[PDB]
Amino acid sequence: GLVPRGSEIKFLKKEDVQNIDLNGMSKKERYEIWRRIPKVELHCHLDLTFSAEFFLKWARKYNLQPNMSDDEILDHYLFTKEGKSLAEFIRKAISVSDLYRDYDFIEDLAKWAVIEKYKEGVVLMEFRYSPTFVSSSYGLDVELIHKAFIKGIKNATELLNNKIHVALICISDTGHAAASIKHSGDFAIKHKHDFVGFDHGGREIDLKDHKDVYHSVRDHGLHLTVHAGEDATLPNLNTLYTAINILNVERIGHGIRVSESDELIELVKKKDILLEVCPISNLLLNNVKSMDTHPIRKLYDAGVKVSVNSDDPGMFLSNINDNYEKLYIHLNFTLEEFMIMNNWAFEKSFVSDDVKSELKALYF
Amino acid sequence: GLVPRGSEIKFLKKEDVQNIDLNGMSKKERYEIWRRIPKVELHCHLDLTFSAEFFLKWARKYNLQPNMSDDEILDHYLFTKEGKSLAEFIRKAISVSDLYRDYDFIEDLAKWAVIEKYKEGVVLMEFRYSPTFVSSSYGLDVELIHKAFIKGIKNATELLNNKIHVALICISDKHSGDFAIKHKHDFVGFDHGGREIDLKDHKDVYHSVRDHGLHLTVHAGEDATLPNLNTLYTAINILNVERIGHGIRVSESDELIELVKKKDILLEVCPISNLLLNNVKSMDTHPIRKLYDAGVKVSVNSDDPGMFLSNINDNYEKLYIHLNFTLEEFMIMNNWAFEKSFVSDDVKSELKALYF
Numbered sequence: 265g266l267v268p269r270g271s272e273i274k275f276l277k278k279e280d281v282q283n284i285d286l287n288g289m290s291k292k293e294r295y296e297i298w299r300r301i302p303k304v305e306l307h308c309h310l311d312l313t314f315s316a317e318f319f320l321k322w323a324r325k326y327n328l329q330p331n332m333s334d335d336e337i338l339d340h341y342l343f344t345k346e347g348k349s350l351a352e353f354i355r356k357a358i359s360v361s362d363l364y365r366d367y368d369f370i371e372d373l374a375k376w377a378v379i380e381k382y383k384e385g386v387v388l389m390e391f392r393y394s395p396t397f398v399s400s401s402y403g404l405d406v407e408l409i410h411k412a413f414i415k416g417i418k419n420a421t422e423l424l425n426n427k428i429h430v431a432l433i434c435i436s437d438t439g440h441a442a443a444s445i446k447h448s449g450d451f452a453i454k455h456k457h458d459f460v461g462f463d464h465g466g467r468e469i470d471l472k473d474h475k476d477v478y479h480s481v482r483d484h485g486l487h488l489t490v491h492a493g494e495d496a497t498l499p500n501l502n503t504l505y506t507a508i509n510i511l512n513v514e515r516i517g518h519g520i521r522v523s524e525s526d527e528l529i530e531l532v533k534k535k536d537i538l539l540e541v542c543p544i545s546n547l548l549l550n551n552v553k554s555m556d557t558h559p560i561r562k563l564y565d566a567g568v569k570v571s572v573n574s575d576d577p578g579m580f581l582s583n584i585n586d587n588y589e590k591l592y593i594h595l596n597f598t599l600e601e602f603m604i605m606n607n608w609a610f611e612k613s614f615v616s617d618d619v620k621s622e623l624k625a626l627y628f
Numbered sequence: 629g630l631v632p633r634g635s636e637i638k639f640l641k642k643e644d645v646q647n648i649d650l651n652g653m654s655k656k657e658r659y660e661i662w663r664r665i666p667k668v669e670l671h672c673h674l675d676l677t678f679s680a681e682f683f684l685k686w687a688r689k690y691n692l693q694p695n696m697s698d699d700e701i702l703d704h705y706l707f708t709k710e711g712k713s714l715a716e717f718i719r720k721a722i723s724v725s726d727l728y729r730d731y732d733f734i735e736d737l738a739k740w741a742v743i744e745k746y747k748e749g750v751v752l753m754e755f756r757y758s759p760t761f762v763s764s765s766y767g768l769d770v771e772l773i774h775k776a777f778i779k780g781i782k783n784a785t786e787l788l789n790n791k792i793h794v795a796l797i798c799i800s801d802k803h804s805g806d807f808a809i810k811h812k813h814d815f816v817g818f819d820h821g822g823r824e825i826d827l828k829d830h831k832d833v834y835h836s837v838r839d840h841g842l843h844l845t846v847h848a849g850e851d852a853t854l855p856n857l858n859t860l861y862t863a864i865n866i867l868n869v870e871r872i873g874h875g876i877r878v879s880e881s882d883e884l885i886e887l888v889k890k891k892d893i894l895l896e897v898c899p900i901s902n903l904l905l906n907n908v909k910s911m912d913t914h915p916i917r918k919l920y921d922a923g924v925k926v927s928v929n930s931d932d933p934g935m936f937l938s939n940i941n942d943n944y945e946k947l948y949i950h951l952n953f954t955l956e957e958f959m960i961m962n963n964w965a966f967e968k969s970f971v972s973d974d975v976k977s978e979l980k981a982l983y984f
């Protein structure tokens with residue numbers, strides 16, 4: 265194991281919380297506090313998780329843009345600036361899938377994604393990836409892609425003395441055909457011993473006809489989440505009703521448009537569903553007007569279970585603690601409230617009771 | 629110009645094709661018949677129009693895939709195989725947009741696209757391109773994009789001795805409405821592609837562009853996954869377009885069939901496109917037969933020759949094989965396409981003196 269004994273993060277105890285004075289601190293001092301929260305992260309797409317330095321290493325290795333500067337490369341591929349559309353994010357994400365050229369990239373991606381989460385002070389990390397997104401550009405074999413992610417992750421956890429625990433959620437393909445829908449859980453089910461969860465993302469659409477396949481996947485022991493209530497542009501909140509009542513999910517990725525309906529606020533609380541909130545993602549994809557008006561404040565105060573998440577660190581060049589900082593500055597979130605949401609994330613995690621008992625003894 | 633007098637295409641005369649027996653022809657022999665139709669092509673995205681050899685030339689020039697064979701490069705980038713998704717098409721079009729790295733590429737693309745249409749026996753070619761799509765990957769200057777497309781077309785028309793007339797349509801972003809308007813001298817029409825949902829909000833820009841004398845077409849009634857046909861009613865009643873790109877879902881409504889007809893609107897049908905993106909279940913079931921038989925004005929188009937490695941005569945061949953199209957019906961559609969072309973009166977007078 266590579267990290268020296270006394271250099272492991274000094275995670276915050278219930279009993280360190282009140283001694284912390286956040287308002288006395290610099291930005292840098294405050295970031296060390298976000299780091300010391302023993303974080304359970306529920307919503308992060310591993311296939312778009314990277315640092316700037318990882319991305320440039322691979323862009324140079326693949327000789328992608330020999331006449332661009334490092335900054336021009338980041339500008340060219342990524343989505344770090346306010347003012348642009350969801351469409352353009354979609355386009356650059358597809359542009360990024362051009363690096364999925366071989367299994368060495370995939371392994372190294374997983375390895376560094378774990379290392380960076382570990383360094384952020386994440387102790388329990390649910391990563392989700394799409395087998396179809398990863399295989400799409402170079403026609404990589406989904407079995408070998410899955411083995412490469414598991415291998416990258418396992419070898420990083422070995423290096424870190426299991427100081428971080430990692431689990432995997434499978435993102436469904438997006439075929440519209442009845443028979444492709446029927447078979448969209450096949451990969452997740454085949455690999456049920458590696459996945460703890462099943463998800464659906466992409467275009468926010470009518471998922472009523474995913475009823476049967478969501479049920480089939482839960483009948484095989486996998487937990488259910490779904491992206492719904494993200495897309496500001498939709499004319500109604502049907503997708504959210506569908507998530508909760510037809511798909512019967514345990515959690516919703518984003519769910520921020522639940523804030524717009526007292527009925528939905530009440531239903532979520534009733535069904536004890538957690539909302540996997542991705543503040544920076546929401547701002548960058550124009551799903552909120554500003555961070556000042558992000559509805560996580562309203563949802564939290566209304567008694568809805570919500571957690572903090574990063575979504576796509578690579579695309580946004582923003583990892584988990586950056587999301588904490590945003591909530592602090594713009595919405596007056598306190599350490600106390602962060603600790604409360606983290607505990608719900610822990611409770612709503614899809615990992616085994618055994619991984620949970622081990623982490624409860626440590627931090628909760 | 630470069631082509632000898634006697635090597636120019638001997639085009640079929642409109643009402644003198646009853647002597648031609650297609651059924652006794654080889655495939656190769658039939659292709660020469662399709663070539664000899666003096667074609668008016670209405671719907672083709674210049675920014676996705678290329679041959680395999682053109683693509684390979686630039687693929688190697690730009691060192692895109694040094695460890696791939698030619699066939700692997702074509703499989704990687706292009707969308708020539710049946711039973712793939714519209715999602716994979718979108719993604720491939722984005723991968724092909726990675727070649728828009730400079731203006732030399734765009735010049736050479738537009739030159740060769742014109743030369744190949746001309747070799748196909750296209751006499752009147754309306755090319756459409758999206759300034760936003762072409763500038764999207766490397767942020768090329770849209771003014772310089774437009775200059776490069778105009779110049780490469782002119783590079784080809786100057787070689788070809790007035791044998792092919794080319795015109796441009798602008799495909800939209802309002803900025804692109806503004807762009808179309810600024811370049812109203814170079815564009816004969818305005819279009820909207822991409823996401824078939826609500827063009828109800830494009831109502832005002834469509835009216836604005838119309839005010840500047842650009843003709844109006846729109847992609848609508850293409851997308852099989854749409855839950856209703858409202859995009860068609862919008863295009864017709866709200867945008868008040870002169871023609872509709874694809875429009876094939878017009879076939880699923882007798883009300884739409886009669887409105888299109890009453891409006892004398894033409895449907896720009898793209899057979900191979902529709903099949904490869906699964907907007908029809910098979911060629912042998914493409915709505916163009918029903919539409920044609922219903923009295924609806926329709927024309928034959930290639931859409932995206934480089935994505936599909938299929939140019940205009942390949943589309944004729946499909947229609948002949950699978951949908952019982954005859955040389956007489958091809959001549960009728962072609963004359964409709966001429967009638968519905970957005971080109972000037974001066975250009976039409978010149979072409980009536982030959983073929984129409």
Ligand SMILES: [Co+2]
Pocket residue numbers: 426429622
């Ligand atoms: Co353990």
Ligand SMILES: [Co+2]
Pocket residue numbers: 307309465491517575
């Ligand atoms: Co997400």
Ligand SMILES: [Co+2]
Pocket residue numbers: 790793978
């Ligand atoms: Co002339």
Ligand SMILES: [Co+2]
Pocket residue numbers: 820823826827830
């Ligand atoms: Co639009």
Ligand SMILES: [Co+2]
Pocket residue numbers: 671673821847873931
């Ligand atoms: Co088109």
